[PDB]
Amino acid sequence: CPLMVKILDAVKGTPAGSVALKVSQKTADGGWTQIATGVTDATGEIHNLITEQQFPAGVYRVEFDTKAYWTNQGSTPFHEVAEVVFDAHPEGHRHYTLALLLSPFSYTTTAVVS
Amino acid sequence: CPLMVKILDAVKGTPAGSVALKVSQKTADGGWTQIATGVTDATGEIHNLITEQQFPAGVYRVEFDTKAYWTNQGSTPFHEVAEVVFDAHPEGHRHYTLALLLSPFSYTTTAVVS
Amino acid sequence: CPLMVKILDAVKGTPAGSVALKVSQKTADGGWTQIATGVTDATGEIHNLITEQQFPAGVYRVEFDTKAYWTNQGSTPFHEVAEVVFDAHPEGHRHYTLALLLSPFSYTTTAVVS
Amino acid sequence: CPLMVKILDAVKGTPAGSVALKVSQKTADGGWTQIATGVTDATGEIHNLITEQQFPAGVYRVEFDTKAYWTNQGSTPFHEVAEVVFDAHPEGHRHYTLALLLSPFSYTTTAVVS
Ligand SMILES: CC(C)(c1cc(Br)c(O)c(Br)c1)c1cc(Br)c(O)c(Br)c1
Numbered sequence: 001c002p003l004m005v006k007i008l009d010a011v012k013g014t015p016a017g018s019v020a021l022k023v024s025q026k027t028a029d030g031g032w033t034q035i036a037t038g039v040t041d042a043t044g045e046i047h048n049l050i051t052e053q054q055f056p057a058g059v060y061r062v063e064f065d066t067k068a069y070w071t072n073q074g075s076t077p078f079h080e081v082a083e084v085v086f087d088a089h090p091e092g093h094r095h096y097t098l099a100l101l102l103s104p105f106s107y108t109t110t111a112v113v114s
Numbered sequence: 115c116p117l118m119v120k121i122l123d124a125v126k127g128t129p130a131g132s133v134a135l136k137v138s139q140k141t142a143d144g145g146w147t148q149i150a151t152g153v154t155d156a157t158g159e160i161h162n163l164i165t166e167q168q169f170p171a172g173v174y175r176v177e178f179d180t181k182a183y184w185t186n187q188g189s190t191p192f193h194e195v196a197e198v199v200f201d202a203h204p205e206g207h208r209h210y211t212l213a214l215l216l217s218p219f220s221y222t223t224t225a226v227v228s
Numbered sequence: 229c230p231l232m233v234k235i236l237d238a239v240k241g242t243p244a245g246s247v248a249l250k251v252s253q254k255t256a257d258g259g260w261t262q263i264a265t266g267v268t269d270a271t272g273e274i275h276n277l278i279t280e281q282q283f284p285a286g287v288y289r290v291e292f293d294t295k296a297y298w299t300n301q302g303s304t305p306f307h308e309v310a311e312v313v314f315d316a317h318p319e320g321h322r323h324y325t326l327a328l329l330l331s332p333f334s335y336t337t338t339a340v341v342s
Numbered sequence: 343c344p345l346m347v348k349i350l351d352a353v354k355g356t357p358a359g360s361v362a363l364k365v366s367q368k369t370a371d372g373g374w375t376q377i378a379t380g381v382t383d384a385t386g387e388i389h390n391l392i393t394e395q396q397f398p399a400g401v402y403r404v405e406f407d408t409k410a411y412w413t414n415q416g417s418t419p420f421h422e423v424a425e426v427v428f429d430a431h432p433e434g435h436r437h438y439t440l441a442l443l444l445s446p447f448s449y450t451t452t453a454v455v456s
């Protein structure tokens with residue numbers, strides 16, 4: 001699997017479970033095609049999000065529903081959504097882990113690229 | 115001005131100058147209307163980016179072109195853009211500062227709301 | 229003033245007011261001399277924390293009492309303090325801004341150096 | 343093992359290998375006893391840093407030699423050292439992972455607490 005996520009809650013110091021997300025691929029004319037959805041498990045991860053066959057080079061977007069996560073935690077959030085938009089270069093079995101650190105008014109998006 | 119940005123370069127320890135961005139307002143059918151653009155000055159800011167009248171309550175997207183910033187610095191970045199999406203409640207001259215901390219494979223988006 | 233701080237609360241989206249800190253200068257035998265203290269104002273800052281004359285070249289530690297800040301907010305933090313340790317080169321009126329972003333289980337320490 | 347680390351390089355998007363660190367425990371009179379050293383492997387981790395027997399409750403400090411890491415990467419760093427100072431509450435087999443995101447002029451210290 002070429003695309004994984006790891007989400008941590010910076011208020012509690014635990015993985016962020018039950019965070020919903022959507023994965024989209026940019027079209028040539030600049031639009032977006034949704035290709036996958038998922039929800040983090042209690043470890044802040046999702047397994048088998050997409051396959052290598054679904055992951056050519058190009059621009060991708062992962063939308064994390066952080067506003068719902070914070071509302072359910074009981075904290076008013078700033079962001080309406082957490083969008084991570086990146087260029088993928090899969091040639092060579094390069095894998096990507098999108099790491100995300102969440103606070104109600106702040107998040108950090110990092111990548112670990114194999 | 116109710117919407118400010120402050121961008122920092124975490125590699126150099128300086129404000130991120132000459133970063134292009136665009137501000138868009140969400141439409142009823144889920145689209146986006148571009149309402150302002152600019153390029154940060156040497157302090158990582160854009161003075162007077164939008165007016166009170168241009169900033170009614172609603173969802174906004176500020177798209178920062180971080181890729182070109184890094185290319186110009188000589189690095190190969192992960193993200194295509196930095197996205198900050200939020201619901202604005204400008205009543206009472208409430209003000210929004212979008213702080214952004216940039217590294218080639220990571221950024222942090224923080225909000226300072228009056 | 230050559231040494232400034234700017235502290236933000238990532239839970240609330242506001243500057244972190246009423247954070248105690250201490251500034252220490254490293255000694256030859258590896259010890260630490262306290263040279264200044266203060267408490268941030270409502271903008272997350274301490275105006276005029278030290279003078280030019282108090283800030284010769286050398287290694288400094290700024291210790292922020294983030295634990296008590298969080299206890300007072302009602303959260304149970306991870307860190308005992310936030311530590312920022314750096315070698316200062318104040319020649320030419322070079323200025324240092326210590327930016328600090330706080331959550332109960334995470335902080336980011338960034339430097340803006342002129 | 344009750345204390346682990348995970349270090350990422352935010353410039354390259356890879357784990358930070360070969361980062362040296364020292365672990366110390368605070369004494370009653372406010373001093374420090376070094377109890378362990380280590381160096382991250384190519385995954386940014388260290389295994390078997392300390393034992394549970396070595397890890398009573400108390401104040402601990404992990405000093406990461408990030409200045410040497412950045413010098414060897416070829417980038418001038420801001421911080422002289424990255425110090426993570428925390429209260430440990432091991433009762434119940436609670437484990438701690440110190441996560442660290444490194445840029446030359448910025449780092450983020452987070453904890454994952456089981
Ligand atoms: C404290 C705050 C929000 C900040 C707000 C304003 Br306005 C400033 O001018 C500066 Br200087 C700092 C900040 C921003 C970023 Br970006 C950081 O990486 C970290 Br750490 C802290």
Ligand SMILES: CC(C)(c1cc(Br)c(O)c(Br)c1)c1cc(Br)c(O)c(Br)c1
Binds near residue numbers: 099100108443454
């Ligand atoms: C989610 C978390 C805590 C993480 C924990 C483990 Br354990 C991992 O192996 C990986 Br990868 C990520 C993390 C860490 C850093 Br350093 C970050 O900059 C961000 Br954003 C998130």
